Design a protein around this ligand. Structure first.
Ligand SMILES: C[C@]1(O)O[C@H](COP(=O)(O)O)[C@@H](O)[C@H](O)[C@H]1O
Ligand SMILES: [Mg+2]
Length: 448
């Protein structure tokens, strides 16, 4: 057997049987042996066990001669930013993002906040930790506390021309995660009126786990937008590397359309740039990027693939439909803060509502949203789908599972790299009826 907490892209486990202070200390020792020379940035989220896991990590790192820079309670993107900004050897965020209260985890990066994933170091660490029965050494290096967020805040604000911002009324919903701290620190520098929902950080999560995809959690943001006449609403997961948008009618915006919107907003500042996108839903992003004078670059989904493709392409922006937005100037890392700043600027500068900015894109490229299927035999289910459609001779692409382009409609069908599911995305060229009949047809085949 192997330690179950070591996943494809990060560490995630129930505390204390799958993840605990002793494992965390061992992870720190193992990480020291994997990095180039330099100090290691540590930060943590609002979960009750997160401080103690970070302290154990720090103890293992310092026992192995690593200086530790403790940036304190923060968002995941702040570990990325500070790891790059401080020219650190690496960084670790202690977080379970959006998982239940008895779970925690770690996200690990090396120099320039490049990801450490299962095949790029994480499983090496796992196997080292699994075999480590050595006595815990004593610290041979120092810890410095560096909680100053000024550089990070200035960097966020550099994405917008503040003299063009209007005093929009924005609902913000931290979900009792960590986002509210950053909103409040940005607020003196912005003209917006914030309506704060579930704002105070609270690791007991009295209003539910910070997962804005849960319909009941969506409804708190929607209600606040509608009841206050807000221009739009923003909700974050617990470590706020994902943000979610609600238009002035309270409508949750499907994240697909944000990729094209943010690409056009970015390409205004940075003309002719490359934009990386995933293969699940594509047509709208390709069109919007091209119409803004950018170059769209198809990439396998998943932050490690997206970031490495952005690096190799010098891409200014990368976006996934699942609320991940990456920015070259942000060390090619994802931010849950930069996106709503860009959208607030777009609404301010264009005189258009968020609703209207995306409405014609939704009409032009209606999509199913991601639909998940737990099936008995994923390979046999996919084969059932492909055999059914074979006589139509779709254009097939294997960048990430199977993409089939039929002309007026297309789908992508993937096995997940983090769960044992099949995931389906369908979109059409302005045809809602075709979207539904094909989505239901594929759904029946997959369940068959
Ligand atoms: C961890 C993670 O959040 O999991 C998402 C879903 O990955 P998947 O199950 O393969 O569809 C990825 O898109 C995302 O980039 C990655 O950061
Ligand atoms: Mg997260």
């Amino acid at each position: 057997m192997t330690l179950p907490a070591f996943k494809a892209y990060d560490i995630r486990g129930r505390v204390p049987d799958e993840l605990n202070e002793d494992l965390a200390r061992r992870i720190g020792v193992a990480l020291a042996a994997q990095l180039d020379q330099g100090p290691v940035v540590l930060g943590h989220d609002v979960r009750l066990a997160s401080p103690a896991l970070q302290e154990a990590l720090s103890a293992g790192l310092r026992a192995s001669g690593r200086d530790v820079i403790d940036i304190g309670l923060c968002g995941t993107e702040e570990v990325y930013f500070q790891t790059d900004y401080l020219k650190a050897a690496g960084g670790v965020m202690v977080t379970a993002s959006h998982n239940p209260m008895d779970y925690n985890g770690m996200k690990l990066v090396r120099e320039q906040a490049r990801p450490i994933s299962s095949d790029t170091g994480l499983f090496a660490i796992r196997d080292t930790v699994a075999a480590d029965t050595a006595a815990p050494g004593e610290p041979t290096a120092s810890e410095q506390s560096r909680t100053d967020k000024t550089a990070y805040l200035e960097h966020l604000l550099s994405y917008v021309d503040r003299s063009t911002l209007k005093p929009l009324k924005l609902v913000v919903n931290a979900g009792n995660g960590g986002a509210g701290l950053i909103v409040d620190l940005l607020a003196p520098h912005l003209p917006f009126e914030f309506v704060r929902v579930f704002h105070e950080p609270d690791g007991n999560f009295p209003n539910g786990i910070p997962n804005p995809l849960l319909p009941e959690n969506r409804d708190a943001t929607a209600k606040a937008v509608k009841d206050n006449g807000a221009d739009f609403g923003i909700a974050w997961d617990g470590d706020f590397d994902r943000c979610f948008f609600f238009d002035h009618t309270g409508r949750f915006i499907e994240g697909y359309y944000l990729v094209g919107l943010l690409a056009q907003a970015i390409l205004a500042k940075q003309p002719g740039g490359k934009v990386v996108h995933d293969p699940r839903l594509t047509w709208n992003t390709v069109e919007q990027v091209e119409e803004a004078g950018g170059i769209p670059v198809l990439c396998k989904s998943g932050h490690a693939f997206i970031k490495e493709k952005m690096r190799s392409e010098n891409a200014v922006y990368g976006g996934e439909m699942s609320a991940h937005h990456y920015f070259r100037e942000f060390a090619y890392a994802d931010s849950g803060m930069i996106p709503w700043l860009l959208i607030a600027e777009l609404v301010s500068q264009s005189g258009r509502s968020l609703a209207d900015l995306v409405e014609a894109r939704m009409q032009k490229f209606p999509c199913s949203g991601e639909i998940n299927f737990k099936v008995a035999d994923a390979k046999a289910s996919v084969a059932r789908v492909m055999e059914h459609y074979a006589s139509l001779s779709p254009e097939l692409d294997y960048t990430d599972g199977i993409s089939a382009d039929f002309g007026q409609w297309r789908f992508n069908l993937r096995s997940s790299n983090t769960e044992p599911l099949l995931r389906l995305n369908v979109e059409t060229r302005g045809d809602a009826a075709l979207l539904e009949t094909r989505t239901q047809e594929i759904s029946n085949l997959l369940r068959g």
